[PDB]
């Protein structure tokens, strides 16, 4: 509910509320992080959808939040990838990438390979169990 | 041009001839070859050992009679009209210019320029133990490629003989091996035109284009069947032992 927005306070509020329950499950250690992650998540979304947005309009989300920590905060975000964009403050333009391809790459065929690698899952397993009646029926 | 059928029946007896004649590398067992030579594809029906003598101690020195063929063709005719002389064979594996002379004998006896036939009596290397030549001109002679027909009659007794992919690769080297050398051969053999004649087609490689993607794109679907290829396995043999063992491992009544 918070993480949908990842609204640090509203976020924290839950924690603020449930910390003991968190503490009860010691999931408390978590989320302390995803705080700005979702913040950075939002930052990525319905936002990077220009080849940029500006410094300040993307800083606007930080003008919503902070300033020139933006630099960090964006680098903080860019650091992880988890978004793909660039900037130049010299430009003051927070330059928000495509993320656009096709399956020209082996990327699908990776998954195919992934699928391929699985081709042995049930296939090789069928032999894994072929035994049991077949072999015990001999008995 | 008229490039030709091959009769295994020939090929076989041909070596028998070689065998029968006990021909050796010193020698080449020679003989008629039969078929009908008109079409831009010629057929080999049959072929006949020409009792012969070969001497390369003196090249042009060798002995043969036609008059075999004379009486031969008669019977051949009487056997079949379709014998009509296409040419002739020898053992080989290789030519000797006296062949040319010998070639021309049959010219009297053949419709077209008749057909030489090399055989590898040791069948050594590869596809064909065989070459078929027609003279030419600066003489010419030439190999047109040839092959077998059906002759399923053959192919059947054939079937009684014998008894996926990596090969396909394997020749990969072969020509290339010789090839570069073959230059360096002729290079340093004559240290001809045909080499440059090859040289052009060379760039026919690194030719590849993002049309490559198509491949990738294509290969995708190729794999789509994957989940299906073994899906039926995935589903099929697994839930098969659960209906035979539960029946059985529990069968176990009395």
């Amino acid at each position: 509910k918070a993480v949908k927005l990842g609204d640090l306070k509203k976020f924290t509020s839950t924690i603020t509320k449930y910390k003991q329950l968190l503490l009860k499950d010691d999931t408390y250690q978590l989320c302390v992080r995803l705080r700005s992650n979702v913040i950075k998540t939002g930052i990525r979304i319905i936002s990077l959808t220009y080849k940029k947005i500006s410094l300040r309009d993307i800083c606007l989300k930080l003008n919503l939040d902070s300033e020139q920590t933006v630099e960090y905060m964006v680098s903080r975000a860019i650091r992880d990838g988890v978004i793909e964009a660039k900037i130049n403050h010299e430009d003051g333009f927070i330059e928000t990438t495509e993320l656009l391809n096709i399956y020209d790459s082996e990327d699908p065929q990776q998954v195919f390979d992934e699928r391929i690698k699985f081709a042995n899952q049930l296939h090789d397993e069928y032999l894994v169990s072929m035994r049991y009646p077949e072999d015990k029926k001999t008995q | 041009h008229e490039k030709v059928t091959i009769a295994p029946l020939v090929l076989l007896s041909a070596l028998d001839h070689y065998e029968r004649t006990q021909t050796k590398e010193n020698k080449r067992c020679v003989g008629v070859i039969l078929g009908d030579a008109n079409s831009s594809t010629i057929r080999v029906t049959n072929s006949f050992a020409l009792p012969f003598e070969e001497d390369e101690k003196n090249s042009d020195v060798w002995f043969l009679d036609h008059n075999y063929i004379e009486n031969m063709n008669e019977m051949c005719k009487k056997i079949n009209a379709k014998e009509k002389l296409i040419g002739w064979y020898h053992s080989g594996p290789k030519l000797r210019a006296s062949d040319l002379k010998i070639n021309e004998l049959f010219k009297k006896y053949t419709q077209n320029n008749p057909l030489l036939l090399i055989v590898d009596v040791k069948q050594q290397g590869v596809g064909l133990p065989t070459d078929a030549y027609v003279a030419i001109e600066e003489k010419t002679f030439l190999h047109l490629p040839c092959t077998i027909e059906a002759e399923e009659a053959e192919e059947i007794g054939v079937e009684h003989l014998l008894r996926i992919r990596l090969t396909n690769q394997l020749k990969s080297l072969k020509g290339l091996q010789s090839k570069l050398k073959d230059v360096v051969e002729y290079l340093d053999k004559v240290i001809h035109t045909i080499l440059g004649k090859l040289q052009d087609v060379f760039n026919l490689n690194n030719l590849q284009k993002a049309l490559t993607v198509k491949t990738n794109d294509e290969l995708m679907v190729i794999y789509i069947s994957n989940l299906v290829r073994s899906i039926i396995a995935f589903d099929d043999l697994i839930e098969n032992k659960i209906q035979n063992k539960k029946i059985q491992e529990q069968r176990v009544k009395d």
Side-chain angles (χ1 to χ4, degrees), chain A residues 2-3 5-13 35 38-39 61:
Chain A
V3 173
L5 294 174
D7 297 345
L8 174 60
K9 180 177 180 178
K10 177 177 64 62
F11 177 88
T12 305
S13 65
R35 301 182 173 278
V38 184
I39 297 170
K61 176 57 180 174

Side-chain angles (χ1 to χ4, degrees), chain A residues 102-106 108-109 112 115-119 122-123 125-126 129-134 136-137, chain B residues 213 215-221 223-224 226-227 229-230 233 237-238 241 244-245 248-249:
Chain A
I102 54 172
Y103 290 157
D104 55 353
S105 173
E106 25 283 303
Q109 306 176 332
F112 288 106
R115 270 39 218 173
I116 301 182
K117 176 228 164 139
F118 288 162
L122 259 204
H123 193 65
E125 256 142 41
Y126 78 146
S129 65
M130 196 99 185
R131 176 183 302 177
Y132 297 89
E134 298 180 346
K136 293 177 179 178
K137 287 168 177 175
Chain B
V213 171
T215 308
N216 297 334
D217 298 338
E218 293 170 349
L219 305 181
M220 300 193 292
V221 178
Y223 302 138
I224 290 176
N226 227 26
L227 295 191
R229 190 293 174 170
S230 294
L237 252 278
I238 302 173
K241 317 296 137 177
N244 308 319
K245 184 176 179 178
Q248 188 54 57
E249 182 188 7

Side-chain angles (χ1 to χ4, degrees), chain A residues 16-17 31 56 76 82 91 94 98 114 125 129 139:
Chain A
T16 304
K17 181 171 183 182
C31 297
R56 286 194 302 279
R76 184 178 188 86
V82 178
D91 297 346
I94 297 174
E98 296 181 353
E114 178 187 5
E125 256 142 41
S129 65
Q139 302 169 336

Side-chain angles (χ1 to χ4, degrees), chain B residues 4 33 115-118 130-134 142-146:
Chain B
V4 183
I33 68 182
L115 181 60
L116 180 152
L117 180 70
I118 284 178
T130 292
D131 277 338
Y133 296 145
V134 63
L142 179 61
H143 191 280
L144 269 68
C146 298

Side-chain angles (χ1 to χ4, degrees), chain A residues 50-89:
Chain A
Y50 175 55
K51 296 178 177 181
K52 301 178 177 178
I53 311 289
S54 171
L55 184 63
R56 286 194 302 279
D57 185 73
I58 286 170
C59 293
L60 169 63
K61 176 57 180 174
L62 298 182
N63 305 337
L64 168 61
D65 300 342
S66 70
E67 298 81 4
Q68 300 307 317
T69 65
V70 176
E71 304 177 348
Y72 296 140
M73 297 180 74
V74 63
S75 298
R76 184 178 188 86
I78 296 174
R79 167 174 178 163
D80 303 343
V82 178
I83 60 170
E84 189 190 3
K86 290 175 180 176
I87 310 168
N88 290 279
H89 301 301

